[PDB]
Each structure stands twice: as structure tokens, then as C-alpha cells.
Tab-separated table of C-alpha atoms in Angstrom:
chain	number	residue	atom	x	y	z
A	28	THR	CA	-33.065	96.234	42.244
A	29	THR	CA	-35.435	96.095	45.214
A	30	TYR	CA	-34.294	95.364	48.759
A	31	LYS	CA	-35.612	91.794	48.748
A	32	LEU	CA	-33.610	89.673	46.310
A	33	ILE	CA	-31.151	87.495	48.229
A	34	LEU	CA	-30.874	84.381	46.067
A	35	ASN	CA	-27.813	82.429	44.947
A	36	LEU	CA	-28.928	78.821	44.496
A	37	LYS	CA	-27.235	78.684	41.092
A	38	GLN	CA	-23.923	78.925	42.918
A	39	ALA	CA	-25.135	77.191	46.061
A	40	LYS	CA	-25.789	74.058	44.018
A	41	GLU	CA	-22.868	74.575	41.637
A	42	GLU	CA	-20.494	74.573	44.587
A	43	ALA	CA	-22.579	71.738	45.964
A	44	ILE	CA	-22.006	69.731	42.789
A	45	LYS	CA	-18.265	69.930	43.377
A	46	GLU	CA	-18.994	68.992	46.992
A	47	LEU	CA	-20.722	65.731	46.088
A	48	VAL	CA	-18.577	65.254	42.983
A	49	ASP	CA	-15.531	65.368	45.230
A	50	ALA	CA	-17.137	63.498	48.126
A	51	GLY	CA	-18.446	60.884	45.684
A	52	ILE	CA	-21.622	59.706	47.431
A	53	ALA	CA	-25.403	59.329	46.994
A	54	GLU	CA	-25.800	61.326	43.783
A	55	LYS	CA	-29.467	61.526	44.805
A	56	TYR	CA	-28.530	64.401	47.096
A	57	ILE	CA	-26.836	66.012	44.108
A	58	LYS	CA	-30.331	66.179	42.622
A	59	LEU	CA	-31.841	68.006	45.614
A	60	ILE	CA	-29.249	70.715	44.998
A	61	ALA	CA	-28.789	70.357	41.248
A	62	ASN	CA	-32.557	70.739	40.920
A	63	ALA	CA	-32.584	73.719	43.299
A	64	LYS	CA	-36.169	74.854	44.104
A	65	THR	CA	-35.001	75.778	47.612
A	66	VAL	CA	-32.012	78.152	47.599
A	67	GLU	CA	-31.829	77.941	51.399
A	68	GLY	CA	-31.933	74.169	51.141
A	69	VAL	CA	-29.523	73.961	48.203
A	70	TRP	CA	-26.944	75.440	50.569
A	71	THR	CA	-28.113	73.317	53.514
A	72	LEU	CA	-28.476	70.047	51.615
A	73	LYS	CA	-24.976	70.623	50.274
A	74	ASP	CA	-23.276	71.381	53.584
A	75	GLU	CA	-25.402	68.617	55.091
A	76	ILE	CA	-24.954	65.967	52.400
A	77	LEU	CA	-21.228	66.574	52.769
A	78	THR	CA	-21.413	66.163	56.537
A	79	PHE	CA	-22.511	62.582	55.793
A	80	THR	CA	-19.145	61.977	54.098
A	81	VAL	CA	-16.361	63.342	56.302
A	82	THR	CA	-13.609	60.987	57.472
A	83	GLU	CA	-11.019	63.637	58.322
């Protein structure tokens, strides 16, 4: 419906949960995503909050 409905925060944060749940860090960030409110952010905060926990 409509040509202006590009939202997927439910999954952006869900995947993000696993991101922080696996990275085990400041759960606080898990709230910025778990709480959504900013689909674009949910995906950014996730990829970002993970970037702060990469010791590859």
C-alpha cells in the first residue's frame, strides 16, 4: 500500500538485540534499539553500538 512505507525497525532492533546480546555490552544501547522510535537509528545504533565492541 502506498509508495511511501519503508519501515523495518521491528527487525532492525530484533537483529540488533542479537547484536548486543552476542556482543554483551552496554545494554543501554539495547534500549535505544529495543525502544525503536527511530527506524533509521535502530539500524544505525545497532551497527554502531556493535562497532564499539569489535576485537576481531
